Protein backbone atom coordinates (compact mmCIF):
# COMPACT_ATOMS: atom_id res chain seq x y z
CA UNK A 1 0.00 0.00 0.00
CA UNK A 2 3.27 2.36 -0.40
CA UNK A 3 2.21 4.41 2.95
CA UNK A 4 -1.50 5.79 1.86
CA UNK A 5 -0.66 9.22 1.41
CA UNK A 6 -3.30 11.11 2.10
CA UNK A 7 -3.37 13.83 -0.66
CA UNK A 8 -5.59 16.24 0.26
CA UNK A 9 -5.10 17.86 3.01
CA UNK A 10 -6.15 20.93 1.97
CA UNK A 11 -5.10 22.45 -1.53
CA UNK A 12 -5.26 22.91 -4.60
CA UNK A 13 -5.35 19.97 -7.32
CA UNK A 14 -3.98 20.18 -10.71
CA UNK A 15 -4.06 16.44 -12.34
CA UNK A 16 -2.39 17.80 -15.56
CA UNK A 17 1.12 18.25 -13.86
CA UNK A 18 0.84 14.33 -13.89
CA UNK A 19 0.73 14.49 -17.54
CA UNK A 20 4.32 16.20 -17.48
CA UNK A 21 5.91 13.80 -14.83
CA UNK A 22 6.28 10.50 -16.93
CA UNK A 23 5.27 8.60 -20.11
CA UNK A 24 2.35 6.56 -19.28
CA UNK A 25 0.63 3.46 -20.38
CA UNK A 26 -2.58 3.65 -18.59
CA UNK A 27 -4.95 5.66 -16.71
CA UNK A 28 -8.70 4.01 -16.45
CA UNK A 29 -10.85 6.60 -14.03
CA UNK A 30 -13.88 5.19 -13.05
CA UNK A 31 -15.17 8.77 -12.72
CA UNK A 32 -14.31 12.01 -15.22
CA UNK A 33 -11.04 11.28 -16.84
CA UNK A 34 -10.78 14.63 -17.51
CA UNK A 35 -10.70 16.38 -14.11
CA UNK A 36 -13.74 18.64 -8.78
CA UNK A 37 -14.25 19.01 -5.29
CA UNK A 38 -14.04 15.54 -3.67
CA UNK A 39 -12.95 16.40 0.04
CA UNK A 40 -10.20 13.36 0.35
CA UNK A 41 -7.84 11.94 -2.18
CA UNK A 42 -6.89 8.62 -0.12
CA UNK A 43 -3.45 8.28 -2.93
CA UNK A 44 -1.74 5.36 -2.62
CA UNK A 45 0.99 3.48 -4.82
CA UNK B 1 7.93 31.81 33.37
CA UNK B 2 7.29 28.20 30.96
CA UNK B 3 4.58 25.85 30.96
CA UNK B 4 2.37 23.32 28.93
CA UNK B 5 3.31 19.96 28.10
CA UNK B 6 1.10 17.92 25.45
CA UNK B 7 0.72 14.46 26.56
CA UNK B 8 0.17 13.05 22.61
CA UNK B 9 -2.17 13.60 19.42
CA UNK B 10 -2.37 11.21 16.82
CA UNK B 11 -4.96 11.31 13.44
CA UNK B 12 -4.73 14.76 12.29
CA UNK B 13 -6.95 16.00 10.20
CA UNK B 14 -6.12 19.80 9.93
CA UNK B 15 -3.34 22.47 10.69
CA UNK B 16 -3.76 26.48 9.78
CA UNK B 17 -0.97 28.82 11.58
CA UNK B 18 -1.52 32.93 12.01
CA UNK B 19 -3.64 34.21 10.18
CA UNK B 20 -3.83 37.75 11.83
CA UNK B 21 0.07 37.45 12.21
CA UNK B 22 -0.07 39.31 15.59
CA UNK B 23 -1.42 36.54 17.36
CA UNK B 24 -1.72 49.67 27.40
CA UNK B 25 -3.77 46.05 27.99
CA UNK B 26 -7.04 45.65 25.57
CA UNK B 27 -10.23 43.78 25.92
CA UNK B 28 -9.86 40.89 23.67
CA UNK B 29 -13.35 39.69 22.54
CA UNK B 30 -13.74 36.52 20.35
CA UNK B 31 -16.74 34.84 18.90
CA UNK B 32 -16.61 30.95 18.30
CA UNK B 33 -19.62 29.24 16.12
CA UNK B 34 -19.77 25.51 14.30
CA UNK B 35 -21.79 26.71 10.92
CA UNK B 36 -22.85 23.75 8.32
CA UNK B 37 -18.92 22.35 9.39
CA UNK B 38 -17.08 25.61 8.85
CA UNK B 39 -15.81 26.93 11.79
CA UNK B 40 -15.86 30.86 12.42
CA UNK B 41 -14.09 32.88 15.09
Same mark, same amino acid.
Given at each position: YA???TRISNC???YSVLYNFA? +? +?AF???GVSPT???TNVYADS | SESGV????NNCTFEYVSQPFLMFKNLR???FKNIDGYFKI
Open positions: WNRVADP +F +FKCYLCF | YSSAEFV
